[PDB]
């Protein structure tokens, strides 16, 4: 565990309909690389095409539900680039982060340009994300999961500065494994009593390198660029795409529509 | 610019609904003499020639010598599927749009952008058939809609002025006798062809029942099956089907 200091509620796609979501590019890709395997999914030339299968099949699944997806990349690097070239060709908005993708994903949410950051990891919270949605990328039916920072901080009775310090005691990427022999629960207790007495690591979370985007809108998906990186170079089956690329653009009509939708609760 | 008002909009609907079983795209070729819709299907087995005279319409005008209105059939058919019982359809067209308006309890019109579609017709007929038969469209639609289950191929023939509709299915072949001494045929002449046809092609013309009271049937050995569904006010819906 890295964060199990959570009581969080699941959310139906109903509540998520008509919402821009700051999906982490890198996190999404690994998930797609680690999940779907038909016979890693290979092609004719003998390379992994599993990243593309996710970006194609799951993103339509997302758009058909009403979620406007924004993939955020930071910086094989060619796998990432040919993931971007697909997303440009699909029309789905793309944002290049100055350093940390999830920090940018948090910042887009913080600017009100996204409703929430989406990742399987919790790092977005520590970068100032208002909300974190899990399980978009991936009895036990896996439903979307929502963590609200405002509700989290109130229930644990801490501030954002404090959660960062707890993150330090648990372990971030800047301090992998954190302080040994202190877990989440012990970290929470410690900071709830004091305030940490790495002095730079705080600054990497509080105020990291992020950009105002300058975008972020759904464009028309053209096939003359989609087929080139899917059906040929990385060898996909066009038979599936014909009925799939067709529902892609068809999903945009309902997705961009839902974006304009007002809530009946602004007249209560 | 073209304007044509159709009183029996539901009937009109069934004409175009048939064409849609054969064609995905067609032209309304509107002239001072009337409105023509024709074309060949992708498999090249069926050519259809449907003419609706100016008198078929309740008030009809065309500003030019000829006007070509290109439309996707399923789009027009879906619109036409929204017709009400008491409604009257009015077709108009301008520089860019084809408009279909239903007028009844209230007015509601649908617009579709003009489409470019190849008017190749033809290319089929210089034909004289050895056998011709007149019958009510209703009874034709009974025989075919109840025979359409069995067989990919409808093999019909004539003998002693009597017209026999045979289909060879999985277990046994069932045949239907149509004659004037029977009650199903009105008039018939000629001798003595035996041909077979693609069952799906014939069965797809049966909705013309809802648009035509009587019809003519022309056939011959080695030559096309011509169905001429007589339409109101001297109109006609021609369907040539190539032989198997």
């Amino acid at each position: 565990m890295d964060l199990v200091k959570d009581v969080k509620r699941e959310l139906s796609f109903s509540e998520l309909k008509g919402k821009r979501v700051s999906i982490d590019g890198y996190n999404a890709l690994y998930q797609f690389l680690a999940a779907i395997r038909q016979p890693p999914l290979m092609d004719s030339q003998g390379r992994v095409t599993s990243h593309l299968s996710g970006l194609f099949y799951r993103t339509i699944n997302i758009l058909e539900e009403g979620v406007i997806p924004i993939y955020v990349f930071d910086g094989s690097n060619i796998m990432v680039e040919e993931s971007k070239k697909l997303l440009r060709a699909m029309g789905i908005p793309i944002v290049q982060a100055p350093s940390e993708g999830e920090a940018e994903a948090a910042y887009l949410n913080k600017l009100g340009l996204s409703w929430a950051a989406a990742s399987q990891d919790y790092d977005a919270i520590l970068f100032g994300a208002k909300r974190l949605v899990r399980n978009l990328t991936i009895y036990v039916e896996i439903k979307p999961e929502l963590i609200e920072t405002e509700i989290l901080l109130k229930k644990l009775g801490i501030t954002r500065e404090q959660l960062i310090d707890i993150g330090i005691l648990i372990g971030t990427d800047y301090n992998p494994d954190g302080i040994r022999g202190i877990g989440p629960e012990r970290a929470l207790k410690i900071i709830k009593k004091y305030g940490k007495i790495i002095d730079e690591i705080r600054g990497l979370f509080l105020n990291p390198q992020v950009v105002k985007p300058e975008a972020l809108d759904l464009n028309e998906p053209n096939g003359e660029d989609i087929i080139n990186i899917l059906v040929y170079e990385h060898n996909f089956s066009e038979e599936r795409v014909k009925n799939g690329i067709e529902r892609l653009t068809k999903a945009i009509k309902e997705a961009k529509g839902a974006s304009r939708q007002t809530g009946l609760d602004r007249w209560f | 610019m073209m304007k044509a008002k159709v009183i029996d909009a539901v009937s009109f609907s069934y004409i175009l609904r048939t064409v849609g079983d054969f064609l995905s795209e067609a032209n309304f070729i509107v002239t001072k003499e009337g409105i023509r819709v024709s074309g060949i299907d992708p498999s090249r087995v069926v050519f259809l020639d449907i003419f609706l005279p100016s008198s078929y319409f309740e008030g009809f005008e065309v500003s030019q010598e000829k006007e070509i209105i290109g439309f996707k059939l399923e789009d027009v058919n879906d619109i036409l599927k929204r017709v009400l019982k008491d409604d009257t359809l009015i077709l108009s067209s301008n520089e860019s749009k084809l408009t279909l308006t239903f007028d009844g309890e209230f007015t509601r019109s649908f617009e579709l952008p003009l489409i470019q579609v190849e008017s190749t017709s033809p290319p089929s007929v210089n034909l004289e058939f050895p056998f011709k038969a007149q019958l009510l469209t209703i009874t034709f639609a009974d025989i075919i809609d109840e025979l359409s289950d069995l067989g990919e191929v409808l093999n019909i023939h004539s003998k002693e002025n009597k017209l026999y509709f045979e289909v060879i299915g999985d277990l046994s072949t069932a045949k239907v006798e149509l004659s004037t001494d029977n009650g199903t045929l009105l008039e018939a002449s000629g001798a003595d062809v035996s041909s077979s046809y693609g069952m799906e092609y014939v069965a797809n013309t049966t909705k013309m029942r809802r648009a035509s009271d009587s019809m003519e049937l022309y056939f011959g050995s080695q030559i096309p099956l011509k169905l001429r569904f007589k339409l109101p006010q001297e109109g006609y819906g021609d369907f040539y089907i190539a032989p198997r």
Partner: protein, 244 residues
């Protein structure tokens, strides 16, 4: 404990079936003022409200306003499993009993969790435009719009109501006016508003089962309220949130 009597069981079932178009799990509220039911979809786009004022009921006997959550699907599916008659609600230890007296008589027992009476939180806004018409008119338009696009645009146009839909060059236009077909029309100010075509269809679809007319009301970039008063006195309402 309670006793409620409604003079018309036909309309009672209609209310239940109407809310079912939204939640399939109804929750009635027995207040001092009467009965109501209010479900708000998880997207907060659409809201169904049933309200039957106390004076409209044959008998209304309570002492304490309570809530009754009908045992989700199963129970609300046992109700609509029943069919001119009166209907009676009475309290059981673990739910409620229903008597349908027609001089026939039937009783279906329902297990239902009881609780604290809820609020009737409803959009607080002024709609400058409203009109009355049949349900059939509303159904026609609803089917017409969803056929053409995802979005509907209702607006005032001189002494007419103009309904529009259309995605890419292919549009739909409908005109509604006094006597054609509107029963009554009131335009306080010019108003234009866009709504999800599907959402309009769902709301309209949930208003069949009443011979009574239907009031539709909107404003400039405001929610649309559509309601029917049942012949016996109740009120079924649908609110639809606009697009901006």
């Amino acid at each position: 404990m309670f006793k409620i009597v409604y003079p018309n069981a036909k309309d009672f079932f209609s209310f239940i079936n109407s809310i079912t178009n939204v939640t399939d799990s109804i929750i009635l509220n027995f207040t001092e003022d009467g009965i109501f039911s209010r479900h708000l979809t998880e997207d907060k786009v659409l809201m169904a409200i049933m309200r039957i004022p106390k004076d409209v009921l044959s008998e209304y006997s309570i002492d304490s306003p309570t809530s009754v959550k009908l045992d989700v699907s199963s129970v609300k599916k046992i109700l609509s499993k029943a069919s001119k008659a009166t209907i009676e609600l009475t309290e059981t230890d673990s739910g409620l009993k229903i008597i349908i007296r027609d001089g026939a008589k039937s009783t279906i027992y329902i297990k239902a969790e009881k609780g604290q009476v809820e609020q009737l939180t409803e959009p607080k806004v002024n709609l400058a435009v409203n009109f009355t018409t049949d349900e059939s008119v509303l159904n026609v338009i609803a089917a017409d719009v969803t056929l053409v696009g995802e979005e509907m645009r209702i607006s005032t146009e001189e002494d007419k109501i103009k309904i529009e839909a259309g995605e890419e060059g292919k549009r739909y236009v409908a005109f509604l006016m006094k006597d054609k077909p509107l029963k009554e029309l009131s335009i306080d100010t010019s108003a234009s508003s866009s709504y999800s075509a599907e959402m309009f269809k769902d709301a309209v679809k949930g208003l069949r089962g009443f011979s009574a007319p239907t009031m539709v009301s909107f404003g400039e970039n405001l929610p649309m309220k559509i309601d029917v008063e049942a012949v016996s006195g109740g009120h079924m309402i649908f609110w639809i949130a606009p697009r901006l």
